Each structure stands twice: as C-alpha cells, then as structure tokens.
Amino acid sequence: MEMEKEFEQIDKSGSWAAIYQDIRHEASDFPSRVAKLPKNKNRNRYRDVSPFDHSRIKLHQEDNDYINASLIKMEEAQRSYILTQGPLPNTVGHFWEMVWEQKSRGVVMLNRVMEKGSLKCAQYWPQKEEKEMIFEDTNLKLTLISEDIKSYYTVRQLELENLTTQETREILHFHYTTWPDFGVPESPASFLNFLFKVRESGSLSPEHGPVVVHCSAGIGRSGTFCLADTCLLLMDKRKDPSSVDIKKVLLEMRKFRMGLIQTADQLRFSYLAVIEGAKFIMGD
Numbered sequence: 001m002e003m004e005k006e007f008e009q010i011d012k013s014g015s016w017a018a019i020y021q022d023i024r025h026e027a028s029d030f031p032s033r034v035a036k037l038p039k040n041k042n043r044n045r046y047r048d049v050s051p052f053d054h055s056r057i058k059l060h061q062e063d064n065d066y067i068n069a070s071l072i073k074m075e076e077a078q079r080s081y082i083l084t085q086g087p088l089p090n091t092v093g094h095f096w097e098m099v100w101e102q103k104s105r106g107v108v109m110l111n112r113v114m115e116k117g118s119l120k121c122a123q124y125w126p127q128k129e130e131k132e133m134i135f136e137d138t139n140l141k142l143t144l145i146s147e148d149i150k151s152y153y154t155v156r157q158l159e160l161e162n163l164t165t166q167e168t169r170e171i172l173h174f175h176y177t178t179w180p181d182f183g184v185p186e187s188p189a190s191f192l193n194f195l196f197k198v199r200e201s202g203s204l205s206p207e208h209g210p211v212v213v214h215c216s217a218g219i220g221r222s223g224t225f226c227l228a229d230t231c232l233l234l235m236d237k238r239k240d241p242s243s244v245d246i247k248k249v250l251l252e253m254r255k256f257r258m259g260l261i262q263t264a265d266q267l268r269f270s271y272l273a274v275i276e277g278a279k280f281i282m283g284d
C-alpha cells in the first residue's frame with residue numbers, strides 16, 4: 001500500500017498512537033546481560049536503554065570491552081550504522097576508541113550538549129584549533145581542523161591520532177543543531193537535506209566502517225535518521241518502490257537495537273521525511 005495513502009488514512013483517522021503501540025508490541029526482545037553487569041553501571045546513560053548482547057560493539061581491550069553501542073546491519077539495503085548514546089564524562093575515551101577501531105569516517109550528532117536546561121551529552125570534541133583534547137585512558141588525540149556553521153547544521157573536520165602508532169585519520173562531524181527541545185520539526189526539509197550532506201561526504205559508503213550516529217539515548221532521533229536513509233535507498237533499488245513498508249523496515253532495525261523511534265510523533269515525522277524525500281528525489 002503506497003505509504004502516502006497509508007499516511008493520509010492514519011492522519012484522517014488520528015490512529016498514530018495505535019500504530020506506534022502495535023510496533024512496540026511486535027518488537028524483538030533479546031538479552032542485554034553485558035549492559036546490566038554491575039561493573040558497567042557508570043557506562044550507561046539510561047537504565048532502560050541497553051544494547052542487545054548479539055549486536056553490541058566490542059572495544060578491543062581485555063580489561064572491559066563494554067560500550068552502549070549497537071551495529072544495525074541492513075542486508076537488502078547494503079548499509080550498516082552504529083547507533084550509540086551521547087558520551088558520558090567517563091566514556092568519551094571509549095567513544096573515540098570505537099570510532100578508531102571500527103574505521104568510521106563520519107560521526108552524526110542529532111542533539112545539543114544542553115537541552116531543556118540539562119546536559120544531554122559530554123563536550124566530547126575540541127572547540128578551538130589550538131586547544132586539542134587528549135584521552136589518556138585510550139591513548140588518542142583529537143584536534144579541530146575546521147568548522148563550517150550553517151543555519152540548520154554545522155560540519156567539522158577533526159584529526160584523530162592513535163598516539164600508540166602515530167597514525168592519523170580525518171573524521172567528519174555532522175551536527176544537526178535545530179531539532180526542537182519539544183516535539184519534532186514541522187517540515188522535514190532541513191532534516192532530509194542534512195542526510196543528503198552526510199551521504200555526499202562518503203561517510204555512509206561501503207569503503208569506510210559504519211557511520212557512528214547518536215542523540216542523547218541513541219534510539220529516538222538516531223532511529224529517525226537510519227530509518228529514513230534505509231527506506232529511501234530501498235525505494236531506489238527495488239522495481240516497485242511502493243513495496244517499501246516503513247513499519248517492516250523499523251521492526252527489522254529493532255532486531256539490532258531496542259526502542260528505535262521513541263514516540264508516535266517521531267513515527268509520523270519518519271513517514272513524512274520518506275514521502276517528501278521520495279516525491280522530491282523521484283524525478284529530481
């Protein structure tokens with residue numbers, strides 16, 4: 001069923017809450033036993049958001065391999081994403097270790113450091129060229145190379161140095177800065193264009209490790225980003241683009257990380273983004 005028609009049918013009937021609860025009921029439940037070990041309590045931002053054991057990212061160290069991060073592997077779309085929480089003061093070194101070990105080119109940030117008067121994630125990248133950051137626990141150095149500030153997003157070029165081998169890599173930081181403190185954006189235009197800029201960069205392409213995507217919990221806004229990207233890629237690839245079922249793509253993604261899409265308004269916004277993305281790209 002053409003999703004644009006499915007959309008108007010749900011909107012006219014006002015059933016968004018009912019569709020959303022059906023997804024919550026059918027979603028996968030897998031064990032998260034490593035996340036719940038007492039040694040990992042200060043590595044988790046939220047008690048109710050944990051990576052599944054089968055899909056968690058492992059840090060390459062013998063001490064403690066745990067980070068709150070999941071590999072989402074979309075077999076038919078041929079795309080992989082790492083979805084993670086906003087780093088905590090004691091996990092900023094783990095975060096950059098993961099970026100290094102997984103060979104990621106891009107980090108996608110969908111939140112502000114402060115929202116609703118509270119801290120949503122650590123200040124985990126340098127704000128001035130001449131004031132670099134060193135992560136002594138993981139032996140990494142991070143330098144700001146350049147910054148491009150636009151109305152709806154900022155792109156940063158960063159240099160990450162493995163202090164152990166003196167290898168360096170360029171990491172691109174894509175920071176969507178205008179998601180509102182309350183609700184979802186009214187139009188999905190700035191969002192869909194932001195994704196276009198990430199795609200243009202090569203950060204999502206198979207010659208690199210998976211993109212790292214985060215918000216505060218790494219399930220809501222982060223969920224919206226990967227769901228929209230995968231659905232638009234499948235509409236490009238298939239003979240019948242009307243066959244793409246956004247509810248079935250979201251349940252597939254929920255096999256790899258719990259809770260993706262946190263509200264009925266985020267579900268509606270995801271539909272709007274894919275539709276508007278579709279109608280915009282199909283011919284243009």
Ligand SMILES: CCc1ccc(C(=O)NCc2cnn(C)c2)s1
Pocket residue numbers: 188189190192193196273276277278280281284
């Ligand atoms: C209603 C106005 C819109 C703004 C953004 C839209 C989108 O979905 N993608 C952006 C974009 C740019 N270039 N390509 C290929 C995609 S639609």
